[PDB]
Write a protein that binds this ligand. Structure first.
Ligand SMILES: COc1ccccc1-c1c[nH]c2ncc(-c3cncc(C(=O)N(C)C)c3)cc12
Length: 271
């Protein structure tokens, strides 16, 4: 209602900062509390660069989905900058899977998780956005196994079909598509490749990918058509989808729209 009104800007003193969450595992991301609504929130901040932060904030102002961690506000009028998002009480999926009782987090739950994530990614796909760091460590868990994709530091709205990373830029090798590793070319399809790896993390309940292989041999192995083996207890149809996500030719990988209806159907069939 006033000249400098901005629907996302919050007054920093409105937020109580507590401690760095995820054991510093995510950088300057802290648990905090939004006093006025007595709400626990996650708050990412900056030290004393900024283009990246502003871009991340900008991206979050544009995406909204049940399975994408929701932006609640920002503090970007002056240092220190804040990106304020809802808090997911159970932390990240990688840790959640590694420490769970497997009769509780059963076969049907694994399908539920994949379905939620693929739903978030179908939404990004349709909006022509790419995530660029899909992995179990970047998904979050809420009540009743609610799962949400998080960490949009590398996300961006694409103008065309690919985005070329600057170079000298290093990536999380084990989750990176061949074309991305070799030519820094990212796209929705490179996110689909990462989703396939994420599915393997879900099927193994949090195991590190490419067991025993040196990060250095990864690309050569993929080039020979080596792919991770079917995890013990992973249904054949799920592994099939895994292999499809890892098709060498990006155009040969399924779309997230396809992946999602495939998972939603398997999820329902296991009621
Ligand atoms: C990927 O998450 C992020 C990456 C970058 C910026 C923000 C987040 C983020 C937003 N909401 C969150 N909620 C919980 C945790 C969270 C994850 N893992 C462990 C904890 C934890 O320590 N607790 C207290 C459960 C919390 C992390 C986030």
């Amino acid at each position: 209602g006033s000249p400098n009104y901005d629907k996302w800007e919050m007054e920093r003193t409105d937020i109580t900062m507590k401690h760095k969450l995820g054991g510093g595992q995510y950088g300057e991301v802290y648990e905090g509390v939004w006093k006025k609504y007595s709400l626990t929130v996650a708050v990412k901040t900056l030290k004393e660069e900024v283009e990246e932060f502003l871009k991340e904030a900008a991206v979050m102002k544009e995406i909204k989905h049940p399975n994408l961690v929701q932006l609640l506000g920002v503090c970007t009028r002056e240092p220190p900058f804040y990106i304020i998002t809802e808090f997911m009480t159970y932390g990240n999926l990688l840790d959640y899977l590694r420490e769970c009782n497997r009769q509780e987090v059963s076969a049907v739950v694994l399908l539920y998780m994949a379905t939620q994530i693929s739903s978030a990614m179908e939404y990004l796909e349709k909006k022509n956005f790419i995530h660029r760091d899909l992995a179990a460590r970047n998904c979050l868990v809420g009540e009743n196994h609610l799962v949400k994709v998080a960490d949009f530091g590398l996300s961006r709205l694409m103008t065309g079909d690919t985005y070329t990373a600057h170079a000298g830029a290093k990536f999380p090798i084990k989750w990176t598509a061949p074309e991305s590793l070799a030519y820094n070319k990212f796209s929705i399809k490179s996110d689909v490749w990462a989703f396939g790896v994420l599915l393997w993390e879900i099927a193994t309940y949090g195991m590190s990918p490419y067991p025993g292989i040196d990060l250095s041999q990864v690309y050569e192995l993929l080039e020979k058509d080596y792919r991770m083996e079917r995890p013990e207890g992973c249904p054949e149809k799920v592994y099939e989808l895994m292999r499809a996500c890892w098709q060498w030719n990006p155009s040969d990988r399924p779309s997230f729209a396809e992946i999602h209806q495939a998972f939603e159907t398997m999820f329902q069939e296991s009621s």
